[PDB]
Assembly symmetry: C10
Homo-oligomer: 74 residues x 10
């Protein structure tokens, strides 16, 4: 079981790499929001919900990386 | 059999890396949506279905990374 | 036998990494579509088929990563 | 146990790689804040809180990487 | 024999990583096509063959990643 | 003992990879600062403290990559 | 020799990763060509040869990766 | 002893990877400097010190990668 | 000598990764040239030598990756 | 001793990866130079020394990756 356990811990570490995708993706969404609102303040109420949807969909990819990570750890 | 199970676990972890691609890609689509609607609010109903299509096609790449992951885990 | 099986499962995981390219590339195409349409709405019927060709060619790289992956798993 | 311990410490080092995403993401949010304010100073009080929220959400992806890292080091 | 076969299969998987360059590069070319046509519709017949040349050349890099992959898988 | 020490040193080297995020992110913040001040010099006193906040937060991600590195090296 | 052969084939797969640079680089040159021509059509005969030279030089970095790959596979 | 020495030399090589961040980041700062000065030459004396602070902070990440590297080699 | 030779071949493969830097960097220089000339054709004779210098300095990094590669192979 | 030499060779290869950072960074500086001079030709004598400084500082990161490489090789 030593080899299998060792692999579980290597695997769990590898599985967090994909979180960099959500880290960057979430930022890209919020950057667009800020820039869109700065150029056209009246559009705020329209684009804010688009940013939330964007965030959630990008975040979901990171969430699944973590799930695989924790399946391997536990 | 210990060596094969080890491989399945390390493999599962490696297969989540590609999810960074959906994480970022989905955000890129939403950033475009926000910036297009801020510059031209009247175009919202035209470009929103394009953003949904674009999201879904980028997300499918992540979905299949995750299929490979789950196939290795289980 | 056991070592070869181990290699195929690691190989399968690695072969999905390339899917990040399609995930990002499909997004870049759709981002251009949305931005082009927002700036010039009358061009929609011209650039939409271009985005579809773009998506298809970028997707092909992803498909062939996944092909190698399934040849390794099975 | 020599192999399991070895894996815990390799795994912990690997689990920090994900932090590059928050280091880059946080910067992207702050760049946008700066560029938006320079172009439209009167929007500062509106966008500053959006930038704090964006930072917070981007940061959380980094925090989870480090949690996994700490679990492998100390658990 | 067992170790060589193992390495061929690891090698083949690694050789697909390079395909991400074609996946992204083809997109970049098509993004420029779409943006240039949107800004100047009258130029489309001129830039369309440039986009086909660009896609083809970027794709060729991915084609050779694949050739190495198949040589390791089927050689 | 030998294998665990080996892994601590490999782990410590891997844990520095994440620092590239801070290296790039800090730059992105300063690039926005410079570009926003060039386009609107009157805003500089407003955006300068935003740039310091942004740099600090991006840097914190790299600081924790380093902490893991030092924990493996000196723990 | 089982170990040496294994290494030749792993090495060959790794040596294709560099090809992503040419796949992306070639695209970047062609994107610029397209965008420059769309913005200034009369410049086409001037920039088209610059784009061919840029592609050629970018491609050469890909060609050398594949050479190393072929040496490890066939030499 | 031999395995530990082997690890320190692999570890040393890996620890330089992070230097790509400074290599790119220092460049991004200088690119902004050159672009800002070209667009507004009268701002040079204001933004030059900002670029130097920028360079220094980005360089610090690189320096500490190299510190880990030299601690491993020696 | 089997282990050392195996390492020479792994090492030589790893050493080509850095070539992606020159592949992309050279392109970035030529993209700027093309865009600069398109915006201001009269500047061609001025910026062409800057592009050549840029190319050569970016290429030098790729050249050294290859040197290390061939030292290891031979 | 075979294991240590193996490590030196693999390590040497790994240490050239960071050179991609100079490859790209140097190009980014030169791209800015070209684009700044195209937009404002009169600024050439001001920004050219900034591009040289920027090149040299980005290149130094690559230079030290290469020092680590050569130290491992020899
Ligand atoms: N994404 C995530 O689930 N974020 C939450 C945070 C609060 C608001 C709702 C979404 C991250 C995925 C990786 C782990 C940390 C959270
Ligand atoms: N993409 C995905 O399937 N997203 C869903 C979100 C809800 C609406 C339908 C599409 C991701 C693939 C990787 C794991 C997380 C989901
Ligand atoms: N791209 C892809 O191949 N899409 C096809 C699917 C079949 C019908 C036409 C479009 C993606 C590659 C990765 C997996 C998901 C599909
Ligand atoms: N981000 C982070 O989680 N910041 C939090 C810390 C607790 C108080 C609120 C902000 C970074 C994640 C990586 C480590 C450094 C902090
Ligand atoms: N590009 C590619 O090589 N396309 C060719 C295929 C043969 C017929 C002409 C076009 C892609 C490279 C990655 C895999 C899919 C093809
Ligand atoms: N950023 C960082 O953590 N800076 C701190 C150091 C302590 C005193 C306040 C600023 C860098 C992270 C990578 C290594 C160099 C420091
Ligand atoms: N680039 C390349 O070397 N193209 C050459 C081929 C010979 C004739 C002149 C152009 C690519 C490098 C990776 C493999 C595909 C070609
Ligand atoms: N950055 C760096 O630390 N520069 C210092 C060098 C000493 C004098 C002040 C500037 C680089 C980090 C990687 C190695 C080269 C220097
Ligand atoms: N860079 C390189 O040396 N290019 C030459 C090509 C002819 C004109 C002078 C410069 C590349 C480095 C990696 C191997 C291929 C060449
Ligand atoms: N940078 C470098 O030292 N460039 C020289 C080029 C001539 C003028 C002085 C600086 C590179 C570092 C990695 C290897 C190639 C050189």
């Amino acid at each position: 079981m030593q080899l299998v356990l060792a692999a579980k811990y290597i695997g769990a570490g590898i599985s967090t790499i994909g979180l960099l995708g959500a880290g960057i993706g979430i930022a890209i969404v919020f950057a667009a929001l800020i820039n869109g609102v700065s150029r056209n303040p009246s559009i705020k109420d329209t684009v804010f919900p688009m940013a939330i949807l964007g965030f959630a969909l990008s975040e979901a990819t990171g969430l699944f990386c973590l799930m695989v990570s924790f399946l391997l750890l536990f």
